[PDB]
Amino acid sequence: MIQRTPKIQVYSRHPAENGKSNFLNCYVSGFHPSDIEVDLLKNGERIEKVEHSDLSFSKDWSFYLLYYTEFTPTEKDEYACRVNHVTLSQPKIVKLDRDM
């Protein structure tokens, strides 16, 4: 058996074909087992509508999840990604930093 803590990256992107739109992304990588809980947060509250959740695995059965959705950030709102996994004794919250 192997267990591996996910790496978590939180960032924003504009799709080049629709540049006025903006996406909040949580990329959760390299984890095992695949059991996992992932949410995007706006001002500490779970975002219920997350339109994309893309899961894959590599050759060594490491899992990769891109969890992302359209958002409209203001400078007062705080966004983050919250992950729980067996390797994490408490939920891990990673903020979207200003500029990312």
From Swiss-Prot:
Subcellular location(s) per record: Secreted; Cell surface
Alphabetic keyword roster: Amyloid, Amyloidosis, Disease variant, Disulfide bond, Glycation, Glycoprotein, Immunity, Immunoglobulin domain, MHC I, Pyrrolidone carboxylic acid, Secreted, Signal
A single GO BP: protein refolding
Effect in UniProt of substituting W61G: Decreases tendency towards amyloid formation
Keyword Glycoprotein attributed: yes
Transmembrane feature ranges: none
Positions carrying Pyrrolidone carboxylic acid: Q3
Reported modifications of this chain: Glycation of Ile-2 is observed in long-term hemodialysis patients.
Disulfide bonds, paired cysteine numbers: C26-C81
Variant or mutagenesis effect after changing W61V: Increases tendency towards amyloid formation
Molecular function terms from GO: identical protein binding; MHC class II protein complex binding; peptide antigen binding; protein homodimerization activity; structural molecule activity
Domain of life: Eukaryota
A GO cellular component annotation in the UniProt record: HFE-transferrin receptor complex
Known glycosylation sites: I2, K20, K42, K49, K59, K92, K95
Domain named Ig-like C1-type: residues: 6-94
Disease / disorder: Immunodeficiency 43: A disorder characterized by marked reduction in serum concentrations of immunoglobulins and albumin, and hypoproteinemia due to hypercatabolism. Patients may suffer from recurrent respiratory tract infections and severe skin disease.
Binding partners and assembly: Heterodimer of an alpha chain and a beta chain. Beta-2-microglobulin is the beta-chain of major histocompatibility complex class I molecules. Polymers of beta 2-microglobulin can be found in tissues from patients on long-term hemodialysis. B2M alone (not in complex with HLA-I) interacts with M.tuberculosis EsxA (ESAT-6) and an EsxA-EsxB (CFP-10) complex; the tripartite complex can be detected in the host endoplasmic reticulum. The B2M-EsxA complex can be detected in patients with pleural tuberculosis and is stable from pH 4.0 to 8.0 and in the presence of 2M NaCl.
Family stated for the protein in its record: Belongs to the beta-2-microglobulin family.
Job description of the protein: Component of the class I major histocompatibility complex (MHC). Involved in the presentation of peptide antigens to the immune system. Exogenously applied M.tuberculosis EsxA or EsxA-EsxB (or EsxA expressed in host) binds B2M and decreases its export to the cell surface (total protein levels do not change), probably leading to defects in class I antigen presentation.
The protein's name: Beta-2-microglobulin
Organism from which the protein derives: Homo sapiens (Human)
Organism taxonomic ancestry: Eukaryota, Metazoa, Chordata, Craniata, Vertebrata
